[PDB]
C-alpha cells in the first residue's frame, strides 16, 4: 500500500516552470526513488491562463486553498515576494505539510520562526535551492560536515558580479562598459542593484554562516560592500601584484586572545592571488570554499543561478521530503546551539590595498609609513612612480590587521597634505 505523495508548487516562473516540467517528465524515476508516486495537485500563480504550458485547471490564484488541500503533502514555495512566501510557508507547516523553498531573502532574515514551526508540526523544511543554485552547499554543511569543525566558508556566490569582474579582468574594460555588456547579454538585469551592491551575496552569506557555525546570523549582521568602485586601474594594479579581483562572501569562526569564539559574515571586493582556486572561477559560475579542521579545504563549483540548476536543487529537496514522509521520520533539525556573538567588520583581521596620488617628493613615503606604523600596521609591499613632472602614484599593501586600524589609517592618509587623494581601497584575501 503506497499512497501517492501530493505536491503543490507555488510559482510558475523561471524555477517553478522547470520544477513542474521535471515532476512531469521524470515521474517514473521520481516515483521509483521516493517509493510512491509523486503527483502534482495544483500550481499557485497570479495570472491564470491556458498559455502557460499547463492545463488551466491546475492553475490557481488562491494560494491558501492550494496549500491547505488534504491530498497535498509537500508545498514548494517558488514565488518571489517574502510576505506571501512567509504566509504560505507558515499555513502549510501548520497543517502538517512539508515545505521546500528557494527563497534567499526569507531564509536570510529568519529561519528561526519557520524551523520551529516545522519542528512543531513534525514535518520537513528544506531550502537548499536558496544558496548556490544547483551547487550542493547546505546539505554538505549540515550533514556531511556535521562531525567536523568548519572554520571558514568563502567563495563566489553571485554570478552577475563575477561575470562583470571576470570581463573587466579579461578585456580591461571599464566597469561601465562591462556592466553594459553584462546587461545586454542577459547576465545582468535592468536594475542590477541587488547584485553589484552585494545584497544578494550578503543574504547568502548570512545563510552559509548560520549553517556552517551553528549560530543564528541574519542579513542585517553581514557587512556589505559592492563592486561599483572597482576600476580597470584596480585590475591593472592587481595583475601587477599577482592578483585578480572577486566579490567574495566570507564566513569565519574567529577566536580572540581571551579565547572566546565569535562569527564573522561579510561580503566585499577582494584582491585574490592568481594561484588561489577562486581566481580561476570566471563568467557567471559560483564556487564555495569550506575550511574544516579534519577535512581541510573543500571546493564546490557549478552554476549558482538559473531556472534549471535551481530546480535541480529544489527537486532533490522534494525527493528527500517525499522519502521522509513515505518511511516516516523527518530529516535534520535546526542546529543553532552555539549562540556565537557577531563580530563587526572593524574587529576582523584583513589586509588593505591602498592606491593614492601623492606629491613627488622623497619624504612622502616616510609620512605614509609612519601613519601605518603609528596604528601598529605593518606594510608588506609598496610601489611608487611618477605621472605625466606633476605627482606620483603610491600603492601600498598591508600585512594583516583589524579592519578598524586600517580604516583609521586610510582616513589619516586622506587628511595628509602630501596625499592628493586616496583613489582606491580594496581588501585582500587568500594569501
**Among 8, 10, 30, 130, contact with a second copy (rule: CB under 8 A):** 30
3-state secondary structure 74-131: EEEECCCCHHHHHHHHHHHHHCCCEEEECCHHHHHHCCHHHHHHHHHCCCCEECHHHC
Q: Kindly state the smallest distance separating residue 77's Cβ from a second copy, in Å.
A: 16
Query: Which one of ligand NAP, a second copy, none is in contact with 240 (Cβ closer than 5 to 8 A by kind)?
Result: none
Task: Estimate the crossing angle of helix 175-184 against helix 159-171, to 10 degrees.
Answer: 120
The mark string for 256-295 relative to a second copy (x by CB under 8 A, - otherwise) is ---------------------x--x-----------xxxx
Answer for which of 4, 37, 84, 316 binds ligand NAP (CB under 6 A) is: 84
Burial class, 297, CB count within 10 angstroms (exposed 0-12 / middle 13-18 / buried 19+): exposed
Do the annotations mark residue 52 as ligand-binding? yes
Residue 204 designated active-site: yes
Return the residue of 96, 300, 347, 349 that touches a second copy, per CB under 8 A.
Answer: 300
99-127: b (≥16 Cβ within 10 Å) or e = bbbbbbbbbbbebeebbebbeebebbbbb
Q: Is 307 in the site for ligand NAP (CB under 6 A)?
A: yes
Nearest to 421 by CA among 406, 410, 408: 410
Kindly identify the residues of this chain, within the stretch 38-67, that bind ligand NAP according to CB under 6 A: 44-47, 63
Region for 31 from its dihedrals, namely left if φ exceeds 0, alpha if ψ lies in -120 to 50, beta otherwise? alpha
Contact between 104 and ligand NAP per CB under 6 A: yes
> By CB under 8 A, is residue 332 in contact with a second copy?
yes
Q: Which stretch binds a second copy (CB under 8 A): 133-141, 201-209, 354-362, 378-386?
A: 133-141
Ligand-binding annotation for 271, yes or no, is: no
The annotation status of 17 as a binding-site residue, yes or no, is: yes
CB contact at 8 A, 413 and 356: yes
Cα–Cα dist 312/391, whole Å: 56
State how far the alpha carbon of 188 is from the alpha carbons of 182, 202, 234, 283, in Å.
Answer: 5, 18, 22, 12
| 311 lines the binding site for a second copy (CB under 8 A) | yes
* Helix, strand, coil % over all residues of the chain, rounded to 5: 40, 25, 35
Which string of x and - marks every residue 182-221 that binds a second copy (by CB under 8 A)? Answer: --------------------------------x-------
16 labeled binding residue: yes
Cα distances (angstroms) measured from residue 42 to each of 87, 104, 377, 398, 430: 18, 24, 61, 58, 48
Pick one of a second copy, ligand NAP, none as the site partner of residue 224 (Cβ within 5 to 8 A by kind).
Answer: none
H helices, E strands: number in the chain: 15, 17
Residue 302 interacts with ligand NAP (CB under 6 A): yes or no: no
Positions that interact with ligand NAP (CB under 6 A): 11-16, 44-47, 63, 78-81, 84, 102-104, 129, 133, 305-307, 310
Positions that interact with a second copy (CB under 8 A): 18, 22, 26, 29-30, 32-33, 35, 128, 134-136, 139-140, 143-149, 214, 277, 280, 292-303, 308-309, 311-320, 323-324, 327-333, 335, 337
Residues classed as catalytic: 204
Amino acid at each position: 500500500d503506497q499512497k501517492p505523495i501530493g505536491v503543490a508548487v507555488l510559482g510558475l516562473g523561471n524555477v517553478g516552470s522547470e520544477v513542474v516540467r521535471i515532476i512531469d517528465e521524470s515521474a517514473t524515476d521520481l516515483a521509483a526513488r521516493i517509493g510512491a508516486p509523486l503527483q502534482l495537485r495544483g500550481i499557485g500563480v497570479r495570472r491564470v491562463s491556458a498559455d502557460r504550458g499547463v492545463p488551466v485547471e491546475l492553475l490557481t490564484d488562491n494560494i491558501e486553498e492550494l496549500v491547505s488541500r488534504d491530498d497535498v503533502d509537500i508545498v514548494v514555495e517558488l514565488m518571489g515576494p517574502v510576505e506571501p512566501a512567509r504566509k504560505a510557508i507558515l499555513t502549510a507547516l501548520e497543517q502538517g505539510k512539508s515545505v521546500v523553498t528557494a527563497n534567499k531573502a526569507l531564509m536570510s532574515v529568519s529561519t528561526g520562526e519557520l524551523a520551529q514551526a516545522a519542528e512543531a508540526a513534525h514535518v520537513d523544511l528544506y531550502f537548499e535551492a536558496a544558496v548556490a543554485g544547483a551547487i550542493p552547499v547546505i546539505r554538505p554543511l549540515t550533514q556531511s560536515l556535521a562531525g567536523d569543525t568548519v572554520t571558514r566558508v568563502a567563495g563566489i556566490v553571485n554570478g552577475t558580479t563575477n561575470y562583470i569582474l571576470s570581463a573587466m579582468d579579461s578585456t580591461g574594460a571599464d566597469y561601465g562598459d562591462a556592466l553594459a555588456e553584462a546587461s545586454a547579454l542577459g547576465y545582468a538585469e535592468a536594475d542590477p542593484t541587488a547584485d553589484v551592491e552585494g545584497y544578494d551575496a550578503a543574504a547568502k552569506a548570512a545563510i552559509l554562516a548560520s549553517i556552517a557555525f551553528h549560530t543564528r546570523v541574519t542579513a542585517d549582521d553581514v557587512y556589505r560592500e559592492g563592486i561599483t568602485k572597482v576600476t580597470a586601474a584596480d585590475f591593472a594594479s592587481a595583475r601587477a601584484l599577482g592578483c585578480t579581483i572577486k566579490l567574495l562572501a566570507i564566513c569565519e569562526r574567529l577566536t580572540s586572545d581571551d579565547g572566546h569564539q565569535s562569527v564573522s559574515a561579510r561580503v566585499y571586493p577582494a584582491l585574490v592571488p592568481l594561484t588561489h582556486p577562486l581566481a580561476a572561477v570566471n563568467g557567471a559560475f559560483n564556487a564555495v570554499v569550506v575550511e574544516a579542521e579534519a577535512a581541510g579545504r573543500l571546493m564546490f563549483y557549478g552554476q549558482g543561478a538559473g531556472g534549471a540548476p535551481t530546480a535541480s536543487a529544489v527537486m532533490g529537496d522534494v525527493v528527500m521530503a517525499a522519502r521522509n514522509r513515505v518511511q516516516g521520520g523527518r530529516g535534520p533539525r535546526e542546529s543553532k546551539y552555539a549562540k556565537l556573538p557577531i563580530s563587526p567588520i572593524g574587529d576582523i583581521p584583513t589586509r588593505y590595498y591602498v592606491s593614492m596620488r601623492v606629491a613627488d617628493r622623497p619624504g612622502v613615503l616616510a609620512a605614509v609609513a609612519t601613519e601605518f606604523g603609528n596604528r601598529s600596521v605593518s606594510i608588506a609591499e609598496v610601489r611608487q612612480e611618477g605621472i605625466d613632472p606633476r605627482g606620483a602614484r603610491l600603492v601600498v599593501v598591508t600585512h594583516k590587521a583589524t579592519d578598524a586600524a586600517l580604516s583609521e589609517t586610510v582616513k589619516a592618509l586622506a587628511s595628509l597634505d602630501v596625499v592628493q587623494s586616496v583613489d582606491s581601497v580594496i581588501r585582500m584575501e587568500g594569501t
